[PDB]
Design a protein around this nucleic acid. Structure first.
Ligand SMILES: Nc1ncnc2c1ncn2[C@@H]1O[C@H](COP(=O)(O)OP(=O)(O)O)[C@@H](O)[C@H]1O
Ligand code: BEF
Lengths: 87, 89, 88, 90, 486, 89, 77, 89, 89
DNA sequence: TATGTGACACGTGCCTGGAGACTAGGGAGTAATCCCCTTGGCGGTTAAAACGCGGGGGACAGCGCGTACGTGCGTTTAAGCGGTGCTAGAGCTGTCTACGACCAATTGAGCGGCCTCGGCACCGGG
DNA sequence: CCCGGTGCCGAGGCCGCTCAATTGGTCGTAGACAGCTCTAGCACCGCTTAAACGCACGTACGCGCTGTCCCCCGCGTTTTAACCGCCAAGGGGATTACTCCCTAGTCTCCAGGCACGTGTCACATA
């Protein structure tokens, strides 16, 4: 589960605000739902392009497809910065 | 670790394991888990930011499932993605 | 009164949804005044929806060769129908 | 009295429909598709929550339709129109 | 002689029927336990009830020293009898029944229960439900010194909410009154011992580890542990005035309709086909009309042997007590009695406490002609006194043998001059044999702390011989009927 | 009139002209990306899908207007249709 | 003025095919706005699919995939 | 061939090759292509049956794309499967 | 690479005199391909949810029961059972 | 009226897949256990549902009209069918080289579990 | 509206145990990249002819309500079912070891239909 990571990212945005146990499970299920949707879209995108290897390009396209217009523009900006920092 | 190099709080190794164990593709690139964990980190921080402001309006320190349900209805982009869901309690 | 004939049978399971329940459900949506046939209409709509979801859940349970229906099967059926539940 | 009762049910979140009649109805409906079935409590709870959410959405659409027709009181024709426009007519 | 002398020395407030020798020992043990401060459990049998000893001990405690408030928890059908007995035997003692609606309970507390400690505090006799509901609200304020919990089988499970509510309340000393001390297990026994003695028993694993030659050593070791805590006085050991008890299990053959239903046909449905399947099949089909009582007794169930026993009891001229586990079978019996014309009186959960008291009073009255009295296994099967009826019959047999023994011994009380007769009905070649074997194993466990006979059917001569009770004032295995010996 | 309704329902040709629809599609695509070309089959599919969606929306708003006891459709009818459908953005 | 390319008789014939007897004035602007929104969404999706495959021009397969994910299946293209 | 042995006109081998080439799973059972060929054959037979009846009502000897659209709309079961399906003509 | 011959054969079986055109043939082929892709995807998702690498006939039967609504599902599972029985025998 | 036209049935060389058989090993069917949870009903109270009333807010039927939409004709602007011509861009192929996976050790991360505490309860009133 | 302590009860913090990530190292199969190949999408001048636009109008219609009258709502009774409490069993969820056979591929083989020119004929134009 991502319970400790949800708690850590919450303290970064809101140090004083606390989260309930039920709210932690819902946030964990919400992250797992987004993870399955992005993984499923990247797999379907790989089959359509006849590409066996998935990369950051397919994940970026799956993000721009699932997420709305305003929400995807902010996710791609952070995703591109993470790759350049990792490489 | 690999997660500390990119600066992401979410585990990049756990995401890489789920992609390989989930057999979504034969080969998973090295940049896919680092890119996927960054998208999951921003979406989680965006919901907790709106849910934290909802709990602040009700003068409640603990975020309850009722506060999370009120955050997804206000934002349009969050409702476009999370419109079909139904939060319990 | 010795005979006590007729089991005094209980009402139909579809009639278990009482009028105050439908009234509260309409109030939550924002309905100010409710008519008479509204109760029967919502009973029929709820019956159709429950039939569909229960059929999907029973199919999902038959796929797993299990006798008891679990919450995961209901969640999968509802996600198939276009409404996902969180916290279950 | 009617306006105050809307604010109460919208603020407080609770299971409006009773659990036992809904469970009996679910079992009766499932008996037609397959016999000798058993239900988990979490499954029945999720079924009830989903049914109540769907009914609340249908009631919201019916109220919108009635307001569009310049009538405060909802009618079965409003529910039929909402069902036909939503596309779930079956 | 000596019993009348010690009765005035032990408790002078008691004015009425002088207590006997067993009650003398009981009150002496209770006084010694109160002096030493160790809580005890009374495991007296159904006969020779310890309620008189307990109210005598309470009156003795009220006579000298402190007059603190006393609380008594007992089933609903029992609190009325308890109040009647404490008002008849012990005079000048206030007693109120704290059972009613919310406003009724509030007004009763405001009128009869002073907020501060008063000299004349009426003894409250509440039920399980009202006590569980009011332990936190109104009962938490009143400091209760001595508490008495009748029918300790209610607190058998370790996870009862009533245990939590009682733990929420502050008790100085506790008392348990159980007809049967333990069930066919050790977990509930450990739970009862922990509730009565918190410092002695602390973990169930220790008691489980503590409990041929090896099996004889472990039972003798556990016996010496609880001996000072439990007091057991058998009916036949002390009291010799009451006649002996005979428990005869009559077996009826499976009818044609029962055999057809079994061939067409889990355990609940088998038991339904076993006992009175007529109304059950009728309700499953959906027919509003009911078949005649003659058609029912001819087609389904053991109603043939039931009517044989009924006419035998009519010839013997003695009141009979029938016990049914199911309200459906109870209503079947009531409808059969109403169709036959005999007066019927049923004690059930739907019957209120006032109607229950009225019906038991009419039954105890000798002028009443209601020989057939219907009683449930859950309600009325424990705590009520019915000495006018000598013969008792059990249509169904529950899993727990303690409840069956309680229901069978309800009529077998002190002062019943007529000999008691216990009859058990169980159809052969069914799951009834299995449930009787389970109950037999359970009663064997509680005690340690043939096939052709069950196949055959009882004849008219056998019915007459079993109705003849001259031996109480017959072989151990007869055709169609077997008698069990303790 | 009623005769014009039966003629258009019987015919299957594309009512919207091709050149204005293509110009509109190109103008809309110029916003998301620059220097893009379009295939004729793609433009035809876009036109067919848009015409089908408009016909469905027109059926829905006609039904809504009939429910309101009005033969003439109003923009509030289309608003209610889009609100019940959920496609409002 | 490309949004104005959809002329009034075109919308009138489209409403006649759907079964509308009488049309108002604001219906034209409302339908133009709805069509603009729908085309914007579909074109955004198709441009995404085209940029995935690193192609300059958009093909009919991308439009078909976009319509399929939007819930409308098209056959013959 | 397996098609003639199972009494199905549709090719069992061609469907078996598509399941393996599509990489839908690691391994594919032998009973899957023969079971899948029967479902695809029955659905295609029912569509052509209702579409052929529509052509006979319109006195047309050849099935046109307009006839297929009328068949899926008149049938309630076929409309729910395809959902919002827009034919080319 | 298409089911044109098999579609023509099943059409001649259900309707000897009726002859399908080229556009309707392509539409039927696309519809069959869409149904096959939907069934294969549903079977793959069902196998992945249960962590089953091999796709058996039960997976296809459950996918048919889930996708096809109404009497279509029952008729299709009956046809599939008959076909798999004839193949195994 | 009639024709000729592209749609429809056909051999034909083929040409790239199905089937005909040995295999071999890892996924699937199956005998046994346990104890988590479920089905049924009895007991009681207690808030929740329902039957009967008066009446006042509200759904509904009809009218005069005065804003806006359907219909027809001379007309003007743009859809479109054709034609040339250039060319960015789609698409298939040998490649060779940086990038994904298993495996042996590793060493520290978080899941499993224990204990105290302190934001938020509720109290029944004024 | 705040009131004193109160009573929970999930949150903080710590601990130990350990199976999940990581680094050093080979590789042989996936991919970015220079070339070309032949094909389609870019714009526009020329004619024009069906299609689009606005003024006139006159008549079906949207809107406010006027009267009605009936169909809902709220409150005093009560009366009937949920529900938490609870006894006991037993079908069935969940897991491990086992052994069995079937699904993946390679050597091969012989026929299915796919690209293309052709004789003809049911409308569908005229
Ligand atoms: N001391 C006594 N003297 C006479 N009768 C007594 C005495 N104590 C109890 N009884 C009789 O016993 C009954 C009340 O107690 P009982 O029902 O035996 O208690 P329990 O519930 O322990 O069986 C009445 O019939 C009463 O007459
Ligand atoms: F101890 Be009870 F009153 F039978």
């Amino acid at each position: 589960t991502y319970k400790i990571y949800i708690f850590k990212v919450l303290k970064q945005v809101h140090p004083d605000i606390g989260i309930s146990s039920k709210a932690m499970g819902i946030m964990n299920s919400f992250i797992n739902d987004i993870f399955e949707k992005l993984a499923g879209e990247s797999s379907k995108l790989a089959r359509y392009n006849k590409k066996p290897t998935i990369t950051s390009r397919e994940i970026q396209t799956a993000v721009r497809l699932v997420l709305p217009g305003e929400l995807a523009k902010h996710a791609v900006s952070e995703g591109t910065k993470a790759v350049t920092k990792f490489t | 670790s690999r997660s500390s190099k990119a600066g992401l709080q979410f585990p990049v190794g756990r995401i890489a394991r789920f992609l390989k164990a989930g057999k979504y593709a034969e080969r998973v690139g090295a940049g896919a888990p680092v890119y996927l964990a960054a998208v999951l980190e921003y979406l989680a921080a965006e919901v907790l930011e709106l849910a934290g402001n909802a709990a602040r309006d009700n003068k409640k320190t603990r975020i309850v499932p009722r506060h999370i349900q009120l955050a997804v209805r206000n934002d349009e982009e969050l409702s476009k993605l999370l419109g079909d869901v139904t939060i319990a309690n | 009164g010795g005979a006590k004939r007729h089991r005094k049978v209980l009402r139909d399971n579809i009639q278990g949804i009482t009028k105050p329940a439908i009234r509260r459900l309409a109030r939550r949506g924002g309905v100010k005044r409710i008519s008479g046939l509204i109760y029967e209409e919502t009973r029929g709509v709820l019956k159709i929806f429950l039939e569909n979801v229960i059929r999907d859940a029973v199919t999902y349970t038959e796929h797993a060769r299990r006798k008891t229906v679990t919450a995961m099967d209901v969640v999968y059926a509802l996600k198939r129908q276009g409404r996902t539940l969180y916290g279950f | 009295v009617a306006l105050r009762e809307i604010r109460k049910y919208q603020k407080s979140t609770e299971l409006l429909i009773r659990k036992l009649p809904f469970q009996r109805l679910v079992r009766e409906i499932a008996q037609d598709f397959k016999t000798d079935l058993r239900f988990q409590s979490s499954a029945v709870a999720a079924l009830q929550e989903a049914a109540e959410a769907y009914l609340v959405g249908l009631f919201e659409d019916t109220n919108l339709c009635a307001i569009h027709a310049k009538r405060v009181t909802i009618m079965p024709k409003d529910i039929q129109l909402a069902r036909r426009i939503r596309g779930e007519r079956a | 002689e000596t019993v009348i002398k010690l009765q005035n020395e032990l408790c002078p407030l008691l004015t009425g029927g002088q207590l006997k020798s067993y009650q003398l020992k009981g009150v002496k043990w209770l006084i010694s336990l109160w002096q030493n401060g160790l809580n005890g459990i009374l495991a007296d049998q159904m006969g020779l009830g310890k309620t008189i000893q307990t109210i005598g001990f309470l009156s003795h405690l009220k006579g000298n020293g402190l007059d603190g408030p006393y609380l008594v928890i007992a089933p609903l059908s029992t609190l009325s009898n308890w109040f009647n007995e404490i008002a008849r035997f012990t005079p000048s003692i206030n007693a109120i029944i704290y059972h009613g609606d919310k406003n009724q309970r509030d007004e009763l507390r405001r009128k009869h229960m002073p907020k501060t400690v008063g000299p004349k505090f009426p003894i409250v006799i509440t039920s399980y439900e009202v006590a569980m509901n009011d332990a936190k609200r109104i009962l938490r304020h009143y400091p209760w010194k001595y508490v008495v919990i009748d029918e300790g089988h209610r607190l058998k499970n370790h996870k009862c909410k009533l245990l939590r509510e009682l733990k929420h309340l502050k008790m100085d000393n506790k008392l348990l009154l159980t007809g049967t001390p333990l069930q066919n297990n050790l977990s509930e026994l450990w739970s009862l011992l922990n509730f009565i003695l918190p410092d002695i028993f602390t973990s169930h694993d220790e008691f489980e580890s503590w409990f041929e030659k090896r099996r004889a050593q472990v039972v003798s070791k556990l016996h010496g542990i609880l001996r000072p805590f439990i007091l057991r006085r058998m009916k036949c050991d002390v009291e010799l005035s009451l006649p002996r008890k005979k428990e005869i299990i009559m077996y009826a053959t499976m009818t044609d309709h029962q055999k057809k239903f079994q061939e067409h046909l889990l355990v609940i449905q088998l038991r339904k086909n076993c006992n009175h399947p007529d109304l059950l099949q009728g309700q499953i089909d959906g027919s509003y009309l009911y078949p005649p009582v003659e058609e029912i007794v001819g087609q389904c169930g053991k109603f043939r042997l039931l009517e044989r026993l009924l006419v035998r009891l009519f010839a013997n001229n003695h009141k009979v007590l029938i016990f049914s586990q199911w309200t459906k079978l109870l209503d079947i019996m009531d409808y059969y009695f109403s169709e036959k014309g005999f007066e019927v009186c049923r004690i059930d959960g739907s019957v209120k406490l006032d109607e229950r008291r009225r019906q038991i009073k009419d039954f105890s009255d000798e002028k009443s002609s209601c020989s057939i009295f219907l009683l449930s296994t859950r309600a009325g099967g424990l705590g009520i006194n019915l000495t006018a009826a000598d013969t008792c019959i059990l249509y169904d047999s529950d899993w727990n043998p303690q409840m069956d023994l309680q229901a069978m011994d309800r009529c077998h009380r002190i002062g019943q001059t007529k000999p008691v007769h216990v009859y058990r009905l169980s159809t052969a070649q069914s799951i009834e044999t299995r449930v009787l074997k389970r109950a037999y194993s359970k009663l064997k466990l509680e005690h340690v702390v043939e096939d052709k006979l069950i196949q055959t059917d009882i004849s008219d001569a056998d019915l007459d011989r079993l109705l003849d009770r001259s031996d109480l004032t017959f072989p151990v295995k007869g055709p169609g009927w077997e008698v069990v010996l303790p």
